[PDB]
Amino acid sequence: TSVVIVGKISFCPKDVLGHGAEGTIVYRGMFDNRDVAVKRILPECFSFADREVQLLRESDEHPNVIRYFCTEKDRQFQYIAIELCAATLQEYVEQKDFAHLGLEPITLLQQTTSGLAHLHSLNIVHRNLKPHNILISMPNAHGKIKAMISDFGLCKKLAVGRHSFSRRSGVPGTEGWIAPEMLSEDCKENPTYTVDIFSAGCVFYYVISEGSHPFGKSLQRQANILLGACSLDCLHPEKHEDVIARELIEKMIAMDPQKRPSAKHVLKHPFFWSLEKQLQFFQDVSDRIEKESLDGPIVKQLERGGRAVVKMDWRENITVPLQTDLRKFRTYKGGSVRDLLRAMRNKKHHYRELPAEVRETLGSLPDDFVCYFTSRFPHLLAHTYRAMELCSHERLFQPYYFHE
Numbered sequence: 001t002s003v004v005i006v007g008k009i010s011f012c013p014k015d016v017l018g019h020g021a022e023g024t025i026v027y028r029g030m031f032d033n034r035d036v037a038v039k040r041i042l043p044e045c046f047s048f049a050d051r052e053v054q055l056l057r058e059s060d061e062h063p064n065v066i067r068y069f070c071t072e073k074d075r076q077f078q079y080i081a082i083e084l085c086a087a088t089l090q091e092y093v094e095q096k097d098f099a100h101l102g103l104e105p106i107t108l109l110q111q112t113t114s115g116l117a118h119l120h121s122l123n124i125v126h127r128n129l130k131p132h133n134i135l136i137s138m139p140n141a142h143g144k145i146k147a148m149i150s151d152f153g154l155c156k157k158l159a160v161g162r163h164s165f166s167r168r169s170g171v172p173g174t175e176g177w178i179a180p181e182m183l184s185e186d187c188k189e190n191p192t193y194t195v196d197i198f199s200a201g202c203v204f205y206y207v208i209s210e211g212s213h214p215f216g217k218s219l220q221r222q223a224n225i226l227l228g229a230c231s232l233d234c235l236h237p238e239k240h241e242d243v244i245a246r247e248l249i250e251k252m253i254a255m256d257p258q259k260r261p262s263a264k265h266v267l268k269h270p271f272f273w274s275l276e277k278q279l280q281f282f283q284d285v286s287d288r289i290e291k292e293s294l295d296g297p298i299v300k301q302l303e304r305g306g307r308a309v310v311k312m313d314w315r316e317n318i319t320v321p322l323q324t325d326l327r328k329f330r331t332y333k334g335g336s337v338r339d340l341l342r343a344m345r346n347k348k349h350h351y352r353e354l355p356a357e358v359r360e361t362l363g364s365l366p367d368d369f370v371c372y373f374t375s376r377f378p379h380l381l382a383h384t385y386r387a388m389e390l391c392s393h394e395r396l397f398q399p400y401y402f403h404e
């Protein structure tokens, strides 16, 4: 029951972290006095392992892609050592109490997307993203953690200019996480990088639902994926945060692969915006449209479907202290999204010199202020974000949209 030694890598075959890939076992081990994980490879996977190690050795590194430390070989097996991680994203979701984690789950999703964007920018599609192979690091000195993409057994490096790859070369992926175009009977378009986005969208929902899947329970998932039968039950249609998440996740898991946002679009989505940045978006919109004509395309687009956004009369859905202070020197259209944004811009720009009873009912700039409105108008941000895509090419909106 002693310790094995192959080069600089040492591990006791008792400390097993997990199995997989028929024969390959992942042990906990040691390399250069560091805690590491060691994957043992049979002779039948020597070719594949050499191709994946070569792909990471040659490719640029990134905090959210797993970095290997060392590879060893004896006359029977090949070994790969990477940094020891605290858990897979799956064990994290199953086992951690989220009540005491704050925004750490969202950060893991942002980091996973950062890693994916890096991979796609090197022309690498992953093809097998799932909670089981997204690794969660040990804490650093300040107690913070990060997600890292692992398991490149199915990944492909596309040639330059090539948008796509053939869906018949290789295992399709892991059942329940495979984009529908990898398996559907009638498919005229080859898969592309958006297969990773579909898988990422399911992971997004799995984390924020703490274990559910957009396409149902295990045995129904892959069939529901082919049908398009998705359900985001845990996202309440009238909570501002759930509306924002539903807007992103529904795009990511869309049946049409060309409707799915790129990893770089996903990184720009308000799903990741801080409260302050949300308020900065509201002010930049209000300033951008202040002198636009009501007949212009931007304002016309912003107002379509806006009556439901503002709840018919937004003046009747705020507090009385704010109502009284809006009648001081001008008038507002209660059914205009643009005028609701004007009111927010003015109260933010004159907040210091507002009455004390008004500053109390609003809360402090910016976090309590912006929540005052998004809690009352849960669709305001989602609707403004879609509507102002007409300006996504403008320098002023580069913080909010991916373009060029």
Ligand SMILES: Cc1nn(C)cc1-c1cc(C(=O)Nc2c(Cl)ccc(NS(=O)(=O)c3ccccc3F)c2F)c2ncnc(N)c2c1
Binding pocket: 017, 018, 019, 020, 026, 037, 038, 039, 052, 053, 056, 066, 067, 068, 080, 081, 082, 083, 084, 085, 086, 087, 088, 091, 135, 150, 151, 152, 153
């Ligand atoms: C199973 C299982 N079941 N359960 C319940 C947990 C686990 C598990 C799995 C792993 C794990 O599999 N590691 C790992 C290793 Cl060691 C080696 C290579 C790759 N991938 S790779 O693409 O072959 C590749 C090839 C070359 C270069 C880089 C690279 F990634 C890799 F992903 C864990 N690794 C660390 N810490 C854990 N706690 C950890 C737990």
